[PDB]
């Protein structure tokens, strides 16, 4: 019942998985060895065997072994099914071309084989939670090949998309927009609701809120895990208003192509800071709409809200939710599209947030998960399109994509598709 198969592609995907399962084993009380010391709250994410062992339903796919066989050496080496974590021989070279045609071709058939052997025990499979990065070669090419076959083998099943998106300023590779643009066909055609992750915005989040001067990506991971667990909170624990994963995405999506909502989490706050605040429902409600708390470097005040979903968890009373949202609709600075004078979807869960012992996040009795679609997010693509022009105008690095079996015009279809998406997110704002 209510099972979800999590897919982890690329270095970013596999390591964000390492952090997510680190959070899940703690919140559901499983040791790193898979045992339960002493409700079926784990059936959503973990499978059970006769010996009392919790086996996650997850696949780690990387075209290179270093990160995954590092996982084979870490504390979670025995938690995972060893041959459901698949390693390739040749890295993706930050190239969508080989990852989509050349190197992922020989390995994808085993990946779908393991997906099938994960699906056949799920009696109530709810959806898919695939993790990757746009800029990475694996996270672009292999995901592009994989959602294609998943959409024809599991077409009815929902496919939530949690992807890591490049920053306006911070970047790790010059070819990142090339990998990002050929991913856009996958999210538009073979995804049901995509969640985009910006590293620089959350860098600002941890700089300002967590007061930590020197966090790593592991600190980024130990909050992406919270956002995904909060999205999955209603499926695993009891709540006064439990939101089904299908109910969720029906509430987000106004049109089949408009399914790209922003995400924010509250309260992101350090342990030294949690003490001096009462941390009411109202202020965590007010903090979410603050542009200084957005996960993507775009100003919501530059845009218009279409769908709003209040995913509260912990000791939160729905009356306080109504009182907060009355204030939210009271201010004019937050102007919603003329589509939704009802505005808000409310979801409340009884489980307080679970704290990572090595994390930088404080223990708070209340936590809220904010997921909202808005027209302001097109700016996060409005710099990437001008960016892609700035390379494609000479055919900057295409000889590699051409040399690995990509048609030259696939870039033309790519920027045509992103232009279509950018237009689609502008007409709905009128």
């Amino acid at each position: 019942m209510r099972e979800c198969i999590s897919i982890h592609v690329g270095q970013a995907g596999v390591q964000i998985g390492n952090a997510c399962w680190e959070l899940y084993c703690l919140e559901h009380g499983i040791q790193p060895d898979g045992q339960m010391p002493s409700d079926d709250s784990f059936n959503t994410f973990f499978s059970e065997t006769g010996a009392g062992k919790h086996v996650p339903r997850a696949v780690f796919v990387d075209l290179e072994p270093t990160v995954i066989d590092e996982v084979r050496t870490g504390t979670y080496r025995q938690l995972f099914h060893p041959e459901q974590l698949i390693t390739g021989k040749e890295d993706a070279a930050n190239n969508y071309a080989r990852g989509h045609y050349t190197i992922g071709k020989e390995i994808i058939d085993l990946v779908l084989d393991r997906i099938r052997k994960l699906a056949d025990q799920c009696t109530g499979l709810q959806g898919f939670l695939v993790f990757h990065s746009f800029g990475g070669g694996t996270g672009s090419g292999f995901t592009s090949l994989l959602m294609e076959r998943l959409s024809v083998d599991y077409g009815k099943k929902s496919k939530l998309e949690f992807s890591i998106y490049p920053a306006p300023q911070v970047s790790t590779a010059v070819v990142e927009p090339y990998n990002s643009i050929l991913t856009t066909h996958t999210t538009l055609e073979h995804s049901d609701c995509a969640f985009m992750v910006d590293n620089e915005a959350i860098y600002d989040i941890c700089r300002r809120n967590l007061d930590i001067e020197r966090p790593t990506y592991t600190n980024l991971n130990r909050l992406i895990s919270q956002i995904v667990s909060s999205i999955t909170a209603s499926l695993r624990f009891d709540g006064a208003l439990n939101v089904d994963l299908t109910e969720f995405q029906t509430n987000l999506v106004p049109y089949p192509r408009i399914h790209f909502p922003l995400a924010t989490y509250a309260p992101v706050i350090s342990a030294e800071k949690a003490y001096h605040e009462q941390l009411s429902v109202a202020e965590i409600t007010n903090a979410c709409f603050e542009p200084a708390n957005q996960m993507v470097k775009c100003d919501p005040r530059h845009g218009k809200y279409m769908a709003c979903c209040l995913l509260y968890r912990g000791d939160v009373v729905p009356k306080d939710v109504n009182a907060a949202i009355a204030t939210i609709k009271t201010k004019r600075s937050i102007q919603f599209v003329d589509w939704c004078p009802t505005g808000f979807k409310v979801g409340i869960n009884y489980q307080p947030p679970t704290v990572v012992p090595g994390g930088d996040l404080a223990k708070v009795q209340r936590a809220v998960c904010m997921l909202s679609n808005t027209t302001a997010i097109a700016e996060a693509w409005a710099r990437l399109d001008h960016k892609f022009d700035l390379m494609y105008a000479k055919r900057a690095f295409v000889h590699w994509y051409v040399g690995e079996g990509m048609e030259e015009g696939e870039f033309s279809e790519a920027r045509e598709d992103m232009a279509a998406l950018e237009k689609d997110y502008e007409e709905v704002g009128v």
């Binding site: 072994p65 990160v67 070279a93 070669g137 300023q169 010059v174 860098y203 966090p215 900057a396």
Partner: protein
């Protein structure tokens, strides 16, 4: 797993490659006799990248030593780590090339190319998953420039898909030790541009400039220049021998670093660099590593980057550091010095970080740069070639080997074509 097969050409190539072998044997904790003596298991997992596992838990490097004289083989085998090498890869002739490119490419090295190919092929088949060939040679003289290009062409012909990276020490006007270097350089880069996926240009003069004006050595010998080369030699391949947060193997660099196929002659560099009496005072923080890294004094060629624009720069950092400051320096360098980086391509830097720093170092930074200013050495080589081309000197010692005038003309034309492309995007 991403095995990398090394080839040494010329006395310059084999001695600098031997000192590189010494350096990375210390990094991997390998005894001079070949046995393992490292401290952590991290030195042990990726031994297969550079060394072959043998009986007794001793490890033999995957290096093919090629020369046309036995004296250099005698020196290297009698050197500090001569005993660790394969007796079979000592493939060598007796009569030298005499700094004649035609000799090495047609007569002297053509007979030994069969004896080098049967060794490189066995080394490659000994590999589990070959990634490429790292070849060390010299553009000066006729051995390294002469036979090196021939066997590079052969291995490229039979290995068309593997990475081809070469580290080339190349002639210079003021520290020239041989009269006939420009012929050799022009006849070598002709094949280097057409065949090599990667070429690192190393100039001796800037190595001297590093050892005096930064390292403050009163008597830095030739081995110190070899050390400066070997530092970047080890740095460029760090990511596929050790774990790091940002893994960037050779092809990771390649896909990010060479915008058009022929723009692949690059600018190496390494940080930190201090004198003996100044390391005690220096703060080795990553921002200071950066301010040292893009300095025109830290580079290993006379081509001053202020006379051109960077196409792509690769900064493979190493050590237990976070990375927000890494991004902030890599954006500040290209923002405050945006006039030195092609504005038309916005993010010119590739960032890689390794978790284990070099032995004795808390952190290190390796510099790889694509600047249009690198044409300074190419056009100067072409000009010096013209000063000894336009009216026929020294050609009897090439044409006597079957060499011909029109091929010299095409080589010069190709140097001009290259300098044209690199001035085009400046």
């Amino acid at each position: 797993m991403r095995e990398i097969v090394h080839i040494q050409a010329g006395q310059c190539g084999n001695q600098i490659g031997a000192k590189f072998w010494e350096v990375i044997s210390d990094e991997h904790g390998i005894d001079p006799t070949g046995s393992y003596h490292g401290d952590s298991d991290l030195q042990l997992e990726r031994i297969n990248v550079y060394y072959n596992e043998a009986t007794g838990n001793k490890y033999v490097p995957r290096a093919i030593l090629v020369d046309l004289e036995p004296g250099t083989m005698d020196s290297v085998r009698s050197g500090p780590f001569g005993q660790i090498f394969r007796p079979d890869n000592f493939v060598f002739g007796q009569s030298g090339a005499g700094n004649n490119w035609a000799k090495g490419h047609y007569t002297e090295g053509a007979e030994l190319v069969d004896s080098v190919l049967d060794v490189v092929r066995k080394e490659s088949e000994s590999c589990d998953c070959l990634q490429g060939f790292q070849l060390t040679h010299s553009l000066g003289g006729g051995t390294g420039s002469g036979m090196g290009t021939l066997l590079i062409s052969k291995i490229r012909e039979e290995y068309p898909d593997r990475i081809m990276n070469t580290f080339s020490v190349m002639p210079s006007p003021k520290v020239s030790d041989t009269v006939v270097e420009p012929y050799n350089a022009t006849l070598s880069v002709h094949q280097l541009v057409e065949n090599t996926d990667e070429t690192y240009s190393i100039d001796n003069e800037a190595l001297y400039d590093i050892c005096f004006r930064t390292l403050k050595l009163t008597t830095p010998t030739y081995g110190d220049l070899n050390h400066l080369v070997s530092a970047t030699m080890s740095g460029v391949t760090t990511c596929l021998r050790f774990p790091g947060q940002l893994n960037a193997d050779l092809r990771k660099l390649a896909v990010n670093m060479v915008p058009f196929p022929r723009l692949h002659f690059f600018m190496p560099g390494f940080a930190p660099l201090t004198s003996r009496g100044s390391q005690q005072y220096r703060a080795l923080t990553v921002p200071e590593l950066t301010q040292q890294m893009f300095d025109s004094k830290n580079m290993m060629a006379a081509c001053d980057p202020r006379h051109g624009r960077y196409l792509t720069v690769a900064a493979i950092f190493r050590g237990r550091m976070s990375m927000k400051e890494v991004d902030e320096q890599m954006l500040n360098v290209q923002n405050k010095n945006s006039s030195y980086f092609v504005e038309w391509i916005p993010n010119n830097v590739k960032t890689a970080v390794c978790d284990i720093p070099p032995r004795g170092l808390k952190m290190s930074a390796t510099f790889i740069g694509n600047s249009t200013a690198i044409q300074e050495l190419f056009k100067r080589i072409s000009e010096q070639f013209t000063a000894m081309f336009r009216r026929k000197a020294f050609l009897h010692w090439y044409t006597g080997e079957g060499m011909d005038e029109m091929e010299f003309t095409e080589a010069e034309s190709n140097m001009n074509d290259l300098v044209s492309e690199y001035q085009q995007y400046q």
